[PDB]
Enzyme design. Structure first.
Site, PDB file in Angstrom:
ATOM      1  N   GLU A   1       0.793  -1.231   0.000  1.00 13.40           N
ATOM      2  CA  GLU A   1       0.000   0.000   0.000  1.00 13.40           C
ATOM      3  C   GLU A   1       0.826   1.281   0.000  1.00 13.40           C
ATOM      4  O   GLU A   1       0.512   2.214  -0.724  1.00 13.40           O
ATOM      5  CB  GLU A   1      -0.963   0.070   1.191  1.00 13.40           C
ATOM      6  CG  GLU A   1      -2.202  -0.830   1.110  1.00 13.40           C
ATOM      7  CD  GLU A   1      -3.169  -0.508  -0.058  1.00 13.40           C
ATOM      8  OE1 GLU A   1      -2.991   0.498  -0.797  1.00 13.40           O
ATOM      9  OE2 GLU A   1      -4.132  -1.292  -0.230  1.00 13.40           O
TER      10      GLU A   1
ATOM     11  N   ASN B   1      -7.534  10.133  -6.023  1.00  9.18           N
ATOM     12  CA  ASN B   1      -8.255   9.390  -7.045  1.00  9.18           C
ATOM     13  C   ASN B   1      -9.115  10.430  -7.749  1.00  9.18           C
ATOM     14  O   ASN B   1     -10.194  10.791  -7.262  1.00  9.18           O
ATOM     15  CB  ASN B   1      -9.131   8.321  -6.392  1.00  9.18           C
ATOM     16  CG  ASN B   1      -8.334   7.383  -5.501  1.00  9.18           C
ATOM     17  OD1 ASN B   1      -7.578   6.531  -5.987  1.00  9.18           O
ATOM     18  ND2 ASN B   1      -8.494   7.533  -4.184  1.00  9.18           N
TER      19      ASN B   1
ATOM     20  N   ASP C   1     -13.099   9.685  -8.547  1.00  8.92           N
ATOM     21  CA  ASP C   1     -14.213   9.908  -7.627  1.00  8.92           C
ATOM     22  C   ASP C   1     -13.957  10.984  -6.575  1.00  8.92           C
ATOM     23  O   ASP C   1     -14.709  11.105  -5.612  1.00  8.92           O
ATOM     24  CB  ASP C   1     -14.658   8.600  -6.973  1.00  8.92           C
ATOM     25  CG  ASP C   1     -13.794   8.207  -5.797  1.00  8.92           C
ATOM     26  OD1 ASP C   1     -12.580   8.506  -5.805  1.00  8.92           O
ATOM     27  OD2 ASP C   1     -14.350   7.608  -4.855  1.00  8.92           O
TER      28      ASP C   1
ATOM     29  N   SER D   1     -11.651  11.252  -4.231  1.00  6.90           N
ATOM     30  CA  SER D   1     -11.327  10.803  -2.887  1.00  6.90           C
ATOM     31  C   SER D   1      -9.805  10.700  -2.792  1.00  6.90           C
ATOM     32  O   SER D   1      -9.111  10.742  -3.816  1.00  6.90           O
ATOM     33  CB  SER D   1     -12.013   9.462  -2.581  1.00  6.90           C
ATOM     34  OG  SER D   1     -11.445   8.406  -3.330  1.00  6.90           O
TER      35      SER D   1
ATOM     36  N   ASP E   1      -6.445   8.565  -0.629  1.00 12.46           N
ATOM     37  CA  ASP E   1      -5.974   7.467   0.229  1.00 12.46           C
ATOM     38  C   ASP E   1      -4.872   8.041   1.112  1.00 12.46           C
ATOM     39  O   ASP E   1      -3.923   8.644   0.608  1.00 12.46           O
ATOM     40  CB  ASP E   1      -5.401   6.331  -0.610  1.00 12.46           C
ATOM     41  CG  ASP E   1      -6.407   5.769  -1.569  1.00 12.46           C
ATOM     42  OD1 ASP E   1      -7.571   5.584  -1.167  1.00 12.46           O
ATOM     43  OD2 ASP E   1      -6.043   5.530  -2.733  1.00 12.46           O
TER      44      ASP E   1
ATOM     45  N   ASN F   1      -9.071   5.048   2.523  1.00 13.59           N
ATOM     46  CA  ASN F   1      -9.834   5.991   1.715  1.00 13.59           C
ATOM     47  C   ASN F   1     -10.785   6.940   2.467  1.00 13.59           C
ATOM     48  O   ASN F   1     -11.557   6.535   3.354  1.00 13.59           O
ATOM     49  CB  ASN F   1     -10.569   5.213   0.613  1.00 13.59           C
ATOM     50  CG  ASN F   1     -11.176   6.118  -0.438  1.00 13.59           C
ATOM     51  OD1 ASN F   1     -12.356   6.456  -0.376  1.00 13.59           O
ATOM     52  ND2 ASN F   1     -10.376   6.495  -1.427  1.00 13.59           N
TER      53      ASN F   1
END
Length: 130
Positions: free
Chosen positions: A35, A46, A49, A51, A53, A60
């Site tokens: 990750e 991202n 959408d 959002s 991380d 998220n």
């Protein structure tokens, strides 16, 4: 902060991750590794959408933490996403625990399915004293 392998394995153990909801420490190490490369400051926006991380586990903002800029997002861990960017991973661990209490368990992270599931993850905790 970028953790050294064994340092992280023990940090996670001290925090109660070893076998949490049936998830071994090596599975958690494999997740963190793929990750963020064990980097607590890792972030990924991202654009698709709107959002983001955050942290060592790349949690998220759409559902788990609040950054105030993700449309119609919730805050299931009840944490500012900023909490997921600290060198101290306790809040991140508390949130990671919250994620896995849901139906998918560790499968919540697609990266875990991609790079840890049905894989030999022994290497992650070897010689760490955990």
């Amino acid at each position: 902060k970028m953790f050294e392998r064994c340092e992280l394995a023990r940090t996670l153990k001290r925090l109660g991750m070893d076998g949490y909801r049936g998830i071994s420490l090596a599975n958690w190490m494999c997740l963190a590794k793929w990750e963020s490369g064990y980097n607590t400051r890792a972030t990924n926006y991202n654009a698709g959408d709107r959002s983001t991380d955050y942290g060592i586990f790349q949690i998220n903002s759409r559902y788990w933490c609040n950054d105030g800029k993700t449309p119609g997002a919730v805050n299931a861990c009840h944490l500012s996403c900023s909490a997921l960017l600290q060198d101290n991973i306790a809040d991140a661990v508390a949130c990671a625990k919250r994620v896995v209490r849901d139906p998918q368990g560790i499968r919540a992270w697609v990266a875990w399915r991609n790079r840890c599931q049905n894989r030999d993850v022994r290497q992650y905790v070897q010689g760490c004293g955990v």
